[PDB]
Amino acid sequence: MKQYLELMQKVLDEGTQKNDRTGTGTLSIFGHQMRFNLQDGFPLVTTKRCHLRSIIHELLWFLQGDTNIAYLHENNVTIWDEWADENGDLGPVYGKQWRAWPTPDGRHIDQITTVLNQLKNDPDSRRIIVSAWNVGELDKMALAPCHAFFQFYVADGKLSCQLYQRSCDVFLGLPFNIASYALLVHMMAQQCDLEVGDFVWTGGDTHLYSNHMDQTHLQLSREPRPLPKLIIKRKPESIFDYRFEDFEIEGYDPHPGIKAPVAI
Amino acid sequence: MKQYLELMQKVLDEGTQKNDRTGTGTLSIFGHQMRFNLQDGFPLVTTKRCHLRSIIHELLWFLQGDTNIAYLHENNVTIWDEWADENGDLGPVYGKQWRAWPTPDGRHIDQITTVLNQLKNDPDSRRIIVSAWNVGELDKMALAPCHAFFQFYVADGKLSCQLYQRSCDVFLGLPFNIASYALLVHMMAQQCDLEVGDFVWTGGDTHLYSNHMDQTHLQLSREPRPLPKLIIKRKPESIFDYRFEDFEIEGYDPHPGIKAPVAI
Numbered sequence A, B: 001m002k003q004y005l006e007l008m009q010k011v012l013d014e015g016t017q018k019n020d021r022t023g024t025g026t027l028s029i030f031g032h033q034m035r036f037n038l039q040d041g042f043p044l045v046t047t048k049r050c051h052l053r054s055i056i057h058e059l060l061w062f063l064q065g066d067t068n069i070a071y072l073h074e075n076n077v078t079i080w081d082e083w084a085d086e087n088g089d090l091g092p093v094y095g096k097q098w099r100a101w102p103t104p105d106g107r108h109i110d111q112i113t114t115v116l117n118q119l120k121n122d123p124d125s126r127r128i129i130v131s132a133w134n135v136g137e138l139d140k141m142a143l144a145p146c147h148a149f150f151q152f153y154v155a156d157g158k159l160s161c162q163l164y165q166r167s168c169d170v171f172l173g174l175p176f177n178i179a180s181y182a183l184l185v186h187m188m189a190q191q192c193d194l195e196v197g198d199f200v201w202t203g204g205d206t207h208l209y210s211n212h213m214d215q216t217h218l219q220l221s222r223e224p225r226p227l228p229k230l231i232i233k234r235k236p237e238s239i240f241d242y243r244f245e246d247f248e249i250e251g252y253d254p255h256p257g258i259k260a261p262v263a264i
Ligand SMILES: *c1cc(=O)[nH]c(=O)n1[C@H]1C[C@H](O)[C@@H](COP(=O)(O)O)O1
Pocket: A021, A143, A144, A145, A146, A147, A167, A168, A169, A170, A173, A174, A177, B126, B127
C-alpha cells in the first residue's frame, strides 16, 4: 500500500539504531500517523501475500474475550505460540481487557459492549474508547499490548477509528494489525447501521528489525496493487456472533510472500 | 505558532458540525498530529498571551498525586473550579492515576516513579508509558481524562514524548496542554541527565467551539513570534520536589490575550 511503503522508507531514511528487549537490534522512528479511507477498499497489503485466516481468527478470538491459544490452534493459527505458557495461556491480554477489565471494587467492564451502546445512543460522545493498557495487570501479561488504545468517532453517518500502537514491528506486525482493525470497523459499522469512514493509525516506537532489512528492500521495490474488497455475507444478532465464513475478500492478487524471523 | 495556527485553520476548513454534551456545538475533525522539536524552544503560543503560573502549578499539582483543587487555590489557579464538588474534589483524576493507580488487589502503582526508573535503567524500552485512562474508575471522575495516554522514548541521548489527547478544545485547552507536557519533558530530562527531544501531540476529537469563532479569526490574523526559552534555575533531588520559582521562561513576547467563554 502507498501509506505502508512510504512509512517503511521513512524508517530507513530517518530511523536511528536502537537495541531492544529481544536483543535483535532495530531501526526506529518515534511518532507517526497515516490514514486509510475504508471506502477506497480493504487495507490488506499487496506488496507481499498476507495470511487472512490468521488475521480473522485472532480478532474473533479477541472479541470472545479469550486469552488461551486453544481456540487459535483449533483453527490452525500459530501466530501466538511463542509466548503462550504450558497451558496455552497468555495472561490478561487483549481479549480479557476488551471484555472484562477488572475494577478495584470487584466489577468487570465490558468495553466492547459499552462502545456499541455508545455508538447507538451517543455517537457524538468524545469518549468512545477501548483500552488494553491495564497498568494493574501488566505484570501478568506474556507481552504488553502493542495496539493499546483506540477511539471511535462518527460524522455524516460514517464510522471512523484511531488506534495508538505504542510498539510496532513494521515488517511483520503492522500488516496484520492494520487489517485487523479495519475489519473491526466494518463489523462495528454493520452492527450500528453506519457506513465505514477512516481508520487512522498512530504509532509510538515504529521500527524495522535488523534481520528484516533485506526483505524490506525487496518489498519496497514492488508496485502496490489495487486494494481488495471486503464482503460480509451476513448480519449477526450481535458483534459477538460473527464467524469466519461470514467474511469474504474479493480481488486479492498480491505479489509473492516474503519470509522473516519473528523477534521473541 | 505555525503548527497550532495551521491546525486551527484546518478545523475551520474541514471541521464538521457536531452537537456535543455541552450543547454549545463544535466544529471538529478526527485524527491529527503535530511535532515540536524542543531544541527550538518552549512551544508556548505567542499569537496570544498564556497564563503560565496556572500551567505550572497544575502540572506540579499532578506530580504530587493531588486530586483536590485546594492546592490550586493556594496559588490563585481557577481552571478546575467548574468541576470540583462541595469539598473541592474532582475524583481520582490525572494526579491520582499518575502517582497511585489502584490495582484490583489493594496495591498501588506509581507510574511516574516507574517511568523515572525505566528512563535510568532501561531507556530502550518501548513500554515507557503512563496512562490516566483507568477504565475501572472513569465513573468516579468529575471529567474523563482529555490528555489520557503518553509515552516516553529515548534516542541519541534525547528524550521525546508523544501524547494522546482523545478530546481537544483547540482554542482554550490545546495551548495549555502543549506547554504542560513540554514542561514535563524538560523536568524528566533533567532528572535523567538527558537532552530534550521531540514532543509529539496526537489528537482524537479535535474541535473549535461555536462561540470561539470570533476569537479564532482574531488570532489567525496575527503573526507568530520566536518561541521563548525555558530555564530551570536549580535542580531538585527528585522530580517530585520542584517548585514554581524553579522555572523561568525567557524571550516571551506574545500578542495581547484573548478572552473567551469556557464550555462546561
Ligand atoms: C506487538 C503486538 C502486535 O499486535 N503488533 C506489533 O507490532 N507488536 C510488536 C511490537 C514489538 O516489535 C514487539 C513487542 O515488543 P515490546 O513489548 O515492545 O518490547 O511486537
